[PDB]
Design a protein around this ligand. Structure first.
Ligand code: CLA
Ligand code: CLA
Ligand code: CLA
Ligand code: CLA
Ligand code: CLA
Ligand code: CLA
Ligand code: CLA
Ligand SMILES: CCCCCCCCCCCCCCCC(=O)OC[C@H](COP(=O)(O)OC[C@@H](O)CO)OC(=O)CCCCCCCCCCCCCCC
Ligand SMILES: CC1=C(/C=C/C(C)=C/C=C/C(C)=C/C=C/C=C(C)/C=C/C=C(C)/C=C/C2=C(C)CCCC2(C)C)C(C)(C)CCC1
Ligand SMILES: CC1=C(/C=C/C(C)=C/C=C/C(C)=C/C=C/C=C(C)/C=C/C=C(C)/C=C/C2=C(C)CCCC2(C)C)C(C)(C)CCC1
Ligand SMILES: CC1=C(C/C=C(\C)CCC[C@H](C)CCC[C@H](C)CCCC(C)C)C(=O)c2ccccc2C1=O
Ligand code: SF4
Ligand code: SF4
Lengths: 132, 146, 74, 741, 161, 60, 80
């Protein structure tokens, strides 16, 4: 239906996509043009909405980078589970991670230089490394 | 728990064959085992050392038993310069007849390996003379390992 | 005799490599720089560059010249 | 007139200003050295023109003039060879008595006692015995004097100067425009009709007028002094009519169509000349004449300026079937817009052609007295085999480079390249299966034979006196080639080569060439060859196909052609680039060619090369121990390496001592390579940090900070030293084993 | 004397080696006409071999049971000629080299293009420095006692020092 | 301390530890590492400058 | 999953976020830097451990650091 015109390749997803998380990428193409598949050789993107399926988030983000840096197209990425659940992944709040977005909260932030971590001997026999 | 390596939850959750490989290579690193304390570490090391001593003594008892049961120790102590000490017999169904004839040496009457460990000279020096002495030593070592 | 000598020399090499490996492990996960302040062991790390550089010089000297003499004879 | 000459006058100014600014070509290196890595980069990107300019015209002008420079270097090398033959060689003495005199054209100054390397080759001469077969080549040309060699060297020097001047002129004075380069039809017409067509025609003329009569007189026993000069064979026709009484008729038969009258010196007898042990010169003359005709004909196939001809673009677009979508649509643009694609094809073809040359030259010795020169035959075979392997792997590497850089999916929609990339997984999986099958079966035959021989169960091995694996197909082909003369090649008097079957051609009591029988050992070794070739193809094809992307790295193309890794993520991502695939393929190519050379050497020493008695009895070098000893790994270790390595190890104190020294040096370099191959960059960087502290403590500190070799450079150095050590070891081994004779 | 070594002057094995070398060279030259360039080269080789063996006999080297000269390197002055004298020369030459190099490093180092002056040597300055190395020991000692030879502890290091 | 003043580095993890670098800019607008310093030698990454806090610099 | 940590030495240039292939990193408002932004690793379950973020870091020592740990299907770079 909305999938880009592709002749098929042996590099698509495999059984884990059916049994584990699969990924989908949607975008809008102003015109019809040829882009390189992360798996196969080449595919034609439809005018308007294009929906594509992949087995790894890295493939989706590589294709998104290709679109952004070559055809200046905005894109969205979702994760589909076998149970039917769908989760929105790449634009987490409608703005790319490079751009600052008020409301985000820091995660994994340490308030001291990297060289002030505790020694391994200090954290020993506890299920933790120096960074944690 | 939940998979092969209990001592590593991270490896237990690993879905690849890596879980197996590292499960072998992290076994004896008691420090890194989940929920490990100093006291349990020391006690496990102590028990492991007991096991290793048992292994060593069983290895020695095996050497003694094989020399006593299949060796030519008595013939060797009679004439220790010309005969070659025997290690153990060779029961290999893959051998061909010429191989069986070729590996028959020393005392003969069976295929045999010529011991290069020097255990014959050592046992002769320390005073052993008969296969009975070797057998008694091996039985004592088996009991010690138990 | 040959078997015994080779056997024990190889085991000695293995044991020495293991000793140094476990010393590296000790430094990684057992050393406490606060408890060894100005200690002999801490001073070992204090001038590690000198130790490593002079060891490298000795190794290069021996290798260069021994190999040179062997090739000269050849 | 679509095909036309276009040039730019004074394209580049000639000055030394750039010569004092190393790294000027690349934008990154032009800023000067901050660390020592810069230095290495300057020698690594020197000839990477595509990465220096974004314009194809500039890259094309650089390639053209670099090719001119290479031609100048080759001509200088030829000049040196010919000059050392004329002034420092015993060519005349060898001419007089080729069998006994050992060729030699190199002399060593006595400075440290190295004059021992001046062997007692013969002819009142002392020098290093050469194995380049130059003496046989010169004799085939009817040189017969050192003045001719001297003038050949002078001409080569002048040609080298002309090539240098042409390179300079075609870069800095008259640089052809890009449209000039993109003429595949015209270029092919000119390279086929003239370079290869008229080249063959001119060489055939030389042979008919110079080489043929001179070599015929030499075979008759005429001393070189009494042989008239070659120009004397061009002025008085009768002087040639005595040798070939068909010139008397002249050129009138040629134009009248009665070519049969030339059968005197244009023959099809084949086989080998019994006297010199080489191919008949008349056969080679007819061969080159026919090739000249064919090349001239084939050079008119492509359309250049007059309507008639073939347009390769239409030709490719026309070939498309149901299984391949768009067929060969877009390949012409690929091969006329990217030098890497063309270089890949050309290198693959040159390498395969070099290997074919190596195979054909030993089977049918083309030059006089080259067959019995066992040292020359072996050296030429191994040299050209190595060159062929290197060229094949280079073709693979440049195909990968094209895929990474010059591949454009927009212009390659659903064509052959697209479809190959789209079933690359199936291709690689099946190649992997066939490689494993070949390896298992072929090498397990050897392991099984070794195990059975060790267990005393000789009746259970894969040997002639045991379970037999006869190469029935090869034997059938040999029989057909044997029966060809008179039935399928009625006008050919003798078989193409005596390898297939026939008499034993021996010259001067030495077996020049004899039939080669194929047994179970030949079967096993041939399947070993196939296994190694399939594995090398696996590695290189996998590097080419997965050069742009993979299930690990969907965006590998952005990382470039050669990069160390993509980090320790996803498990580990070491050696994931196509350059690393070439790095491994070089090892596997070296292994396969080592096996090929060992097979050739042992088979020829044990089954072909040897001596004959007046009765006709044959005595080979190793007594035919190949059949019953080439079927186990221990047999190769003992009867080939250990047994034939006696010459090298015992060469000290003789003229071959240099070969023993090089044997040891090659072993040393091979072992040295393992230091780079096994170790990683971090250790060396930290060691260099300590050494830099030591230097700094004495206020010695280079402004160019030292750096450990990059990961890619570490691998490249390790591979280069590994190959040098292996090649040198086998070089010394073969040359000392085949010069003690 | 030293370790049961008999001087090569009275070593029968040494003379046997000399005779073997000469006789093998003579056997090699017997297959060339007198006066032929190969014959002259082989005769010159024979003469050079004889001179080498005579020089070794006259030098005072110590032979072994194998007849080859052996070197004594325990500091014995009577055998300094073997190792001590050449060693000094080496330590001089290399010393010179090293010193000169260091000076160049510390001369072009005080420039903005210090790196650019290492790939491209300032040949005039380079030769100026190179001509000064014959007094490298004195200059080195003067710098050592003047504190200009070694850098202070205030220099680059690593996290654990 | 001031623009263009030489400062000895004191950051233990820094590639230019115990080395002299020239101050390029100082941020008076708060910030934890406001003092930008530039060194002659390039680190392994090719950069030759870093931000330090005034506590991690010895003045001269 | 791997552990990604950002230290306060960060100068908020965004290069680490751009280099990330799995969209693990992002920019969040901050006040300890001139740019007013700092890197964060809210979703490290998608981190593969390629350490591209560390390679693309101007700060003397890697204000962004990656420590490899337990391996899952996502972090192991497996399409299967
Ligand atoms: C009694 C002495 C002793 C003791 C108690 C230990 C104990 C330990 N060592 Mg140390 N070590 C020793 C000797 C010792 N080692 C020696 C002699 C060496 C030098 C080789 C080392 C080198 C060493 C290193 C380099 C490391 C350790 C580590 C460790 C820890 C983990 C070991 C582990 O997981 O095993 C896993 C066990 C295996 C993977 C089994 C491998 C067995 C060998 C390699 C294969 C043999 C194949 C067989 C011979 C083939 C048959 C031949 C046939 C086909 C013909 C553990 C605390 C590791 C650590 O991190 O500790 C904190 C670590 O990194 N050790
Ligand atoms: C035969 C193999 C070989 C050789 C010669 C070396 C040589 C060396 N190794 Mg390596 N190494 C090897 C194998 C080898 N390694 C392997 C297989 C491993 C396991 C991965 C290692 C692992 C290793 C480590 C981890 C370390 C070494 C170190 C050393 C040095 C030891 C000190 C020494 O001998 O200085 C003398 C140097 C030599 C003998 C090298 C040859 C020098 C030649 C004779 C000079 C030739 C110059 C000539 C003009 C070249 C012209 C080239 C031109 C024609 C193109 C030296 C550079 C140590 C080191 O760096 O010490 C400072 C060190 O830390 N090596
Ligand atoms: C191209 C292939 C080739 C090769 C491999 C050789 C090799 C050899 N030749 Mg042959 N030769 C060649 C071509 C070749 N030559 C040609 C074309 C001619 C015709 C002119 C000759 C004429 C010739 C004669 C007449 C003789 C040789 C001799 C020799 C031997 C000693 C050469 C030597 O070291 O002398 C010493 C050479 C040097 C010390 C080289 C000079 C060093 C320069 C100055 C270094 C400059 C490098 C520079 C800094 C680089 C930057 C560029 C700069 C200019 C800007 C050697 C086996 C001699 C021989 O065999 O004696 C028995 C001998 O007598 N050759
Ligand atoms: C017809 C004349 C002729 C003659 C007398 C020779 C003679 C020779 N050739 Mg040559 N050769 C010829 C034509 C000829 N060749 C042509 C036309 C080709 C192109 C395929 C070749 C390709 C060739 C190769 C690749 C090699 C030789 C070799 C040899 C030598 C091997 C010994 C022998 O008995 O050769 C007998 C020769 C043959 C049995 C080959 C006959 C080939 C036939 C004529 C092919 C005809 C193709 C046909 C015209 C296609 C037309 C298509 C077109 C209309 C579209 C010998 C000197 C070998 C050599 O010198 O190695 C040292 C070698 O390796 N030949
Ligand atoms: C027609 C032949 C041909 C041509 C024109 C090129 C041209 C090129 N190649 Mg290709 N290549 C070829 C053959 C060729 N190659 C072959 C046969 C192989 C197989 C090994 C390769 C493998 C290859 C790889 C893997 C790569 C290239 C690359 C390149 C580019 C850069 C080359 C460069 O900077 O040189 C620099 C030259 C040197 C640094 C000289 C080193 C030469 C070797 C290592 C030493 C030689 C030793 C000597 C023979 C014997 C020493 C004796 C000892 C005792 C001293 C350039 C486009 C590189 C690239 O990125 O291109 C895009 C690249 O990554 N090529
Ligand atoms: C002599 C050492 C050696 C051996 C045996 C192998 C073996 C192999 N290599 Mg490796 N390789 C080696 C050295 C070696 N390599 C080195 C030094 C390099 C560095 C350049 C490489 C680099 C390399 C690459 C880059 C590639 C290979 C590939 C291969 C495979 C080729 C397919 C094959 O033959 O499968 C059959 C296996 C064998 C012939 C091994 C011997 C097995 C015998 C016959 C039977 C063993 C007994 C039996 C199992 C009994 C079972 C019971 C027992 C367990 C008790 C195979 C696994 C290729 C591959 O994997 O793809 C196909 C590949 O791509 N190798
Ligand atoms: C003039 C320059 C210079 C000076 C003064 C020194 C001085 C020293 N080096 Mg360093 N070194 C140098 C260049 C220099 N090196 C270069 C170019 C290399 C790279 C090959 C090294 C690699 C090196 C290592 C790996 C080690 C040393 C070590 C040492 C120390 C002991 C001596 C030694 O082992 O030499 C060894 C020298 C070499 C291995 C190569 C020297 C090559 C040439 C001869 C030197 C450069 C001369 C150059 C042309 C100067 C021209 C001046 C002109 C322009 C005016 C000593 C502090 C050792 C140490 O730390 O001891 C504590 C040590 O382990 N050096
Ligand atoms: C020369 C190679 C000979 C074997 C070719 C096999 C048939 C090959 C053949 O007939 O291909 C023909 C087939 C038909 O393509 P088309 O005729 O539609 O293509 C028209 C062409 O002009 C290209 O546009 O192409 C493919 O399907 C390629 C993938 C082949 C899948 C089968 C591969 C099997 C490979 C292993 C076989 C090895 C046999 C022994 C080799 C010595
Ligand atoms: C009586 C006498 C003698 C003797 C003397 C002597 C004095 C000897 C000595 C000897 C010795 C004296 C030896 C020693 C050796 C040493 C060693 C072998 C060491 C080692 C070390 C190590 C191994 C380390 C380790 C570690 C690490 C790594 C880190 C930290 C931790 C640790 C510590 C663990 C004689 C007869 C001769 C002479 C006369 C007199
Ligand atoms: C080795 C060499 C050399 C030399 C060489 C030479 C010397 C060569 C020559 C060559 C030659 C000398 C060639 C010639 C050629 C010729 C030709 C190729 C011809 C052709 C002709 C034709 C083709 C014709 C045609 C016709 C006629 C017959 C007339 C009528 C019509 C027509 C037109 C059809 C040198 C020393 C420098 C150096 C190194 C390299
Ligand atoms: C030894 C070694 C080094 C250190 C080696 C270095 C720095 C090379 C030193 C080269 C010297 C300084 C040049 C002189 C060498 C010879 C005397 C002759 C020149 C040889 C060619 C350069 C022409 C690495 O950096 C490395 C990096 C990655 C994997 C493996 C390794 C590795 O094995
Ligand atoms: S070991 Fe080296 S090549 Fe492998 S991932 Fe790490 S840095 Fe890259
Ligand atoms: S690359 Fe480094 S400095 Fe730049 S935003 Fe990321 S963590 Fe901060």
């Amino acid at each position: 239906p909305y999938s880009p015109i592709f002749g098929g390749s042996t590099g698509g997803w495999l059984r884990a996509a059916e049994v584990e998380e699969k990924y989908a990428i949607t975008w809008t193409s102003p015109k019809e043009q040829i882009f390189e598949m992360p798996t196969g050789g080449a595919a034609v993107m439809l005018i308007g909405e294009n929906l594509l399926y992949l087995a790894r988030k890295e493939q989706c983000l590589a294709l998104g980078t290709q679109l952004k840096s070559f055809k200046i197209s905005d894109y969205k990425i979702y994760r589909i589970f076998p149970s039917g659940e769908v989760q929105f992944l790449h634009p987490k709040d409608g703005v790319f991670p490079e751009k600052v977005n008020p409301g985000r909260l820091p995660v994994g932030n340490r308030s001291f230089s990297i060289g002030k971590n505790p020694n391994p001997v200090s954290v020993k026999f506890s299920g933790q490394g120096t960074y944690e | 728990a939940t998979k092969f390596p209990k001592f590593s939850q991270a490896l237990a959750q690993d879905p690849t064959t890596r879980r197996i490989w590292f499960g072998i290579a992290t076994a004896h690193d008691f420090e890194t085992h989940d929920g490990m304390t100093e006291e349990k570490l020391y006690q496990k090391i102590f028990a492991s050392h007991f096991g290793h001593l048992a292994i060593i003594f069983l290895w020695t008892s095996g050497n003694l038993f094989h020399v006593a049961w299949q060796g030519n120790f008595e013939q060797w102590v009679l004439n220790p310069l010309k005969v070659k000490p025997i290690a153990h017999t060779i029961w290999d169904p893959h051998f061909g007849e010429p191989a069986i004839k070729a590996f028959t040496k020393g005392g003969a009457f069976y295929p045999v390996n010529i011991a290069y460990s020097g255990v014959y000279h050592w046992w002769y020096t320390i005073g052993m003379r008969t296969n009975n002495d070797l057998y008694l030593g091996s039985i004592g070592l088996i009991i010690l390992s138990g | 005799q040959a078997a015994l000598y080779t056997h024990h020399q190889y085991i000695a090499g293995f044991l020495m490599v293991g000793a140094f490996a476990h010393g590296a492990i000790f430094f990684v996960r057992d050393y406490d720089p606060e408890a060894n302040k100005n200690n002999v062991l801490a001073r070992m790390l204090e001038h590690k560059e000198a130790i490593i550089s002079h060891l490298s010089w000795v190794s290069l000297f021996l290798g260069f010249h021994t190999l040179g003499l062997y090739i000269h004879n050849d | 007139t679509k095909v036309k000459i276009l040039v730019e006058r004074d394209a580049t100014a000639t000055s030394f200003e750039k010569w004092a600014k190393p790294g000027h070509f690349s934008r990154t290196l032009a800023k000067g050295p901050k660390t020592t890595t810069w230095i290495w980069n300057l020698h690594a990107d020197a000839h990477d023109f595509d990465s220096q300019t974004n314009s194809l015209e500039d890259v094309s002008r650089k390639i053209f003039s670099a090719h001119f420079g290479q031609l100048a270097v080759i001509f200088l090398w030829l000049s040196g060879m010919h000059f050392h033959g004329a002034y420092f060689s015993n060519y005349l003495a060898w001419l007089n008595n080729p069998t006994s005199i050992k060729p030699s054209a190199q002399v060593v100054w006595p400075i440290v006692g190295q004059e021992i390397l001046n062997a007692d080759v013969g002819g009142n001469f002392q020098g290093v015995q050469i194995t380049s077969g130059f003496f046989q080549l010169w004799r085939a040309e009817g040189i017969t004097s050192e003045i001719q060699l001297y003038w050949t060297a002078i001409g080569a020097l002048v040609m080298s100067g002309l090539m240098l001047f042409a390179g300079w002129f075609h870069y800095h004075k008259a640089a052809p425009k890009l449209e000039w380069f993109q003429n595949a039809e015209s270029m092919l017409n000119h390279h086929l009709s003239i370079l290869l067509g008229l080249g063959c025609l001119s060489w055939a003329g030389h042979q008919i007028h110079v080489a043929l009569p001179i070599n015929k007189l030499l075979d008759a026993g005429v001393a070189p002094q009494e042989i008239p000069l070659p120009h004397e064979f061009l002025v008085n026709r009768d002087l040639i009519a005595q040798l070939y009484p068909s010139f008397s008729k002249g050129l009138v038969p040629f134009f009248s169509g009665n070519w049969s009258e030339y059968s005197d010196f244009l023959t099809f007898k084949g086989g080998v000349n019994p006297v010199t042990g080489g191919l008949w010169l008349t056969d080679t003359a007819h061969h080159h004449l026919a090739l000249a005709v064919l090349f001239i004909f084939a050079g008119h196939m492509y359309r250049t300026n007059w309507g008639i001809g073939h347009s390769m673009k239409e030709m490719l677009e026309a070939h498309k079937g149901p299984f391949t979508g768009e067929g060969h649509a877009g390949l012409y643009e690929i091969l006329t817009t990217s030098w890497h694609a063309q270089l890949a094809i050309n290198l693959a073809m040159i390498g395969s052609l070099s290997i074919i040359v190596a195979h054909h030259m030993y089977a049918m010795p083309p030059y006089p007295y080259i067959a019995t020169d066992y040292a020359t035959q072996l050296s030429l075979f191994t040299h050209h085999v190595w060159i062929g392997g290197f060229c094949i792997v280079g073709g693979a590497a440049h195909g990968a480079i094209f895929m990474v850089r010059d591949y454009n999916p927009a212009k390659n929609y659903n064509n052959l390249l697209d479809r190959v990339i789209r079933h690359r997984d199936s291709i690689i999986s099946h190649l992997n299966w066939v490689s494993i099958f070949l390896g298992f079966h072929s090498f397990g035959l050897y392991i099984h034979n070794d195990t059975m021989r060790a267990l005393g169960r000789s009746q259970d091995m894969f040997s002639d006196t045991a379970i037999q694996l006869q190469p029935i197909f090869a034997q059938w082909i040999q029989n057909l080639h044997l029966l060809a003369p008179g039935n399928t090649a009625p006008n050919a008097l003798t078989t193409a080569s005596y390898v297939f079957g026939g008499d034993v051609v021996s010259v001067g009591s030495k077996i020049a060439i004899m039939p080669i029988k194929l047994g179970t050992a030949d079967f096993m070794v041939h399947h070993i060859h196939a296994f190694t070739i399939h594995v090398t193809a696996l590695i290189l094809l996998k590097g080419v196909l997965y050069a742009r992307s993979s299930k690990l790295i969907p965006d590998k193309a952005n990382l470039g052609f050669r990069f160390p890794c993509d980090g320790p993520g996803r498990g580990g991502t070491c050696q994931v680039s196509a350059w690393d695939h070439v790095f491994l393929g070089l090892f596997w190519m070296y292994n396969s060619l080592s096996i090929v050379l060992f097979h050739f050497s042992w088979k020829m020493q044990s089954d072909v090369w040897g001596s004959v008695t007046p009765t006709g009895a044959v005595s080979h070098i190793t007594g035919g121990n190949f059949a019953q000893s080439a079927i186990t790994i221990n047999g190769w270790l003992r009867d080939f390496l250990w047994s034939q390595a006696s010459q090298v190890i015992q060469s000290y104190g003789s003229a071959l001592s240099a070969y023993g020294l090089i044997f040891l040096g090659a072993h040393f370099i091979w072992a040295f390579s393992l230091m780079f191959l096994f170790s990683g960059r971090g250790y060396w960087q930290e060691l260099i940090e300590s050494i830099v502290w030591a230097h700094n403590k004495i206020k010695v500190a280079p402004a160019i900070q030292p750096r450990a070799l990059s990961i890619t450079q570490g691998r490249a150095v390790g591979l280069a030293h590994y190959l040098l050590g292996g090649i040198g070891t086998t070089w010394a081994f073969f040359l000392a084993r085949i010069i003690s004779v | 004397d030293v370790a049961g070594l008999i001087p090569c002057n009275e070593s029968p094995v040494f003379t046997k080696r000399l005779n073997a070398s000469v006789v093998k060279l003579e056997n090699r030259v017997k297959k060339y006409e007198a006066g032929s360039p190969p014959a002259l080269a082989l005769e010159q080789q024979i003469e050079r071999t004889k001179q080498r063996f005579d020089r070794y006999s006259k030098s005072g080297l110590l032979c072994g049971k194998d007849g080859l000269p052996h070197l004594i390197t325990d500091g014995r002055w009577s055998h300094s000629i073997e190792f001590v004298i050449p060693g000094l020369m080496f330590l001089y030459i290399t010393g010179w080299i090293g010193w000169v190099g260091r000076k160049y490093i510390r001369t072009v180092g005080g420039d903005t293009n210090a790196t650019e002056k290492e790939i491209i040597i300032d040949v005039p300055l380079a030769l100026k420095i190179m001509s000064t190395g014959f007094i490298w020991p004195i200059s080195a000692w003067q710098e050592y006692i003047s504190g200009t030879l070694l850098a202070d502890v205030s220099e680059i290091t690593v996290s654990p020092r | 301390m001031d623009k263009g003043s030489k400062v000895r580095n004191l950051r233990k993890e820094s590639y230019w530890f115990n080395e002299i670098g020239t101050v390029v800019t100082i941020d008076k607008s708060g910030i934890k590492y406001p003092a930008l310093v530039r060194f002659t030698k390039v680190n392994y990454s090719g950069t030759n400058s870093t931000n330090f806090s005034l506590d991690e610099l010895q003045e001269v | 999953s791997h552990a990604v940590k950002i230290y306060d030495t960060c100068i908020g240039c965004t290069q680490c976020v751009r280099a990330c292939p799995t969209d693990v990193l992002e920019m969040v408002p901050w006040d300890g830097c001139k740019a007013g932004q700092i890197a964060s690793a809210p979703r490290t379950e998608d981190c593969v451990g390629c350490k591209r973020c560390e390679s693309a870091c101007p700060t003397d020592f890697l204000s962004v650091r990656v420590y490899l740990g337990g391996e899952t299907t996502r972090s192991m770079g497996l399409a299967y």
